[PDB]
Amino acid sequence: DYKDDDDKVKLTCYQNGVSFTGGKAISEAKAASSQACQELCEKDAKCRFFTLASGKCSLFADDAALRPTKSDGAVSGNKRCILLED
């Protein structure tokens, strides 16, 4: 209802690459898809760049030393998806 439905929003912003560790995670989830990690991160005002793994999400407020560890079903993402492009 309302005019909120008239406009659409982007919810897809995942990237299957590598998990993260050794960083300064402020909160982590136990989901299977980054989608669930996005909804939980939305509730947190300290999340910006989440990072899902084989079965564990990881929302990060900022970059520090969070490095990869494995690519087994690892799907990490960032705040922005598509920016600065023709």
Short mmCIF file of C-alpha atoms in Angstrom, two decimals:
data_model
loop_
_atom_site.label_atom_id
_atom_site.label_comp_id
_atom_site.label_asym_id
_atom_site.label_seq_id
_atom_site.Cartn_x
_atom_site.Cartn_y
_atom_site.Cartn_z
CA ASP A 1 0.00 0.00 0.00
CA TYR A 2 0.91 3.70 0.10
CA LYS A 3 3.54 5.11 -2.26
CA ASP A 4 6.25 2.95 -0.69
CA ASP A 5 5.21 0.05 -2.92
CA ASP A 6 5.34 2.30 -5.99
CA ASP A 7 9.13 2.42 -5.64
CA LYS A 8 11.43 -0.60 -5.67
CA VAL A 9 14.70 -1.19 -3.80
CA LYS A 10 17.80 -3.32 -4.35
CA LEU A 11 18.36 -6.13 -1.84
CA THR A 12 20.83 -8.22 -3.84
CA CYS A 13 24.46 -7.38 -3.05
CA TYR A 14 26.41 -10.59 -2.43
CA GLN A 15 29.69 -11.85 -3.88
CA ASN A 16 30.92 -15.44 -3.64
CA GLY A 17 34.65 -15.13 -3.01
CA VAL A 18 36.17 -15.80 0.40
CA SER A 19 35.18 -15.64 4.07
CA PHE A 20 36.78 -13.31 6.61
CA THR A 21 38.67 -13.60 9.90
CA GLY A 22 41.22 -11.96 12.16
CA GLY A 23 39.26 -8.76 11.72
CA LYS A 24 37.24 -6.60 14.10
CA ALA A 25 33.78 -8.14 13.68
CA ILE A 26 31.15 -6.47 15.86
CA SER A 27 28.47 -9.07 15.17
CA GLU A 28 28.13 -12.38 13.35
CA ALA A 29 25.11 -14.45 12.32
CA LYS A 30 24.54 -18.16 11.71
CA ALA A 31 22.67 -18.07 8.39
CA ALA A 32 23.21 -19.92 5.12
CA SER A 33 22.56 -17.10 2.66
CA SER A 34 23.85 -13.52 2.76
CA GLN A 35 20.22 -12.49 2.36
CA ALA A 36 19.49 -13.41 5.97
CA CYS A 37 22.73 -11.69 6.94
CA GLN A 38 21.48 -8.52 5.26
CA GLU A 39 18.22 -8.45 7.23
CA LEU A 40 20.04 -8.97 10.53
CA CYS A 41 22.69 -6.40 9.66
CA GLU A 42 19.94 -3.89 8.87
CA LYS A 43 18.84 -4.10 12.51
CA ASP A 44 22.38 -3.19 13.54
CA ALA A 45 23.48 0.44 13.27
CA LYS A 46 27.12 -0.67 13.33
CA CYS A 47 27.09 -2.81 10.18
CA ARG A 48 28.32 -1.66 6.77
CA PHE A 49 30.29 -4.47 5.12
CA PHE A 50 28.91 -7.91 5.98
CA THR A 51 30.66 -11.19 5.19
CA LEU A 52 28.85 -14.53 4.98
CA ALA A 53 30.65 -17.88 4.94
CA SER A 54 29.83 -21.57 4.50
CA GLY A 55 27.25 -20.96 7.21
CA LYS A 56 28.10 -17.88 9.26
CA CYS A 57 27.52 -14.18 8.54
CA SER A 58 29.92 -11.45 9.64
CA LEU A 59 28.94 -7.77 9.66
CA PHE A 60 31.80 -5.28 9.90
CA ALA A 61 31.66 -1.58 10.78
CA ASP A 62 34.97 -0.81 9.07
CA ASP A 63 38.06 -2.39 7.52
CA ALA A 64 41.04 -3.27 9.70
CA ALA A 65 42.73 -6.66 9.35
CA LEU A 66 39.81 -8.87 8.30
CA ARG A 67 41.47 -11.23 5.82
CA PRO A 68 40.14 -14.29 3.93
CA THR A 69 40.56 -17.92 4.99
CA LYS A 70 38.49 -20.11 2.67
CA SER A 71 36.20 -20.01 -0.37
CA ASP A 72 33.96 -22.92 0.65
CA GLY A 73 30.56 -21.33 0.10
CA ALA A 74 31.89 -17.96 1.22
CA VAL A 75 29.85 -14.93 0.19
CA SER A 76 31.00 -11.50 1.38
CA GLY A 77 29.77 -8.03 0.47
CA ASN A 78 30.10 -4.31 1.11
CA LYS A 79 27.99 -1.20 1.72
CA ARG A 80 27.76 -0.22 -1.95
CA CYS A 81 27.33 -2.54 -4.93
CA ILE A 82 27.22 -0.47 -8.11
CA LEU A 83 28.62 3.06 -7.96
CA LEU A 84 30.63 5.39 -10.20
CA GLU A 85 29.81 3.99 -13.64
CA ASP A 86 28.64 5.23 -17.05
#
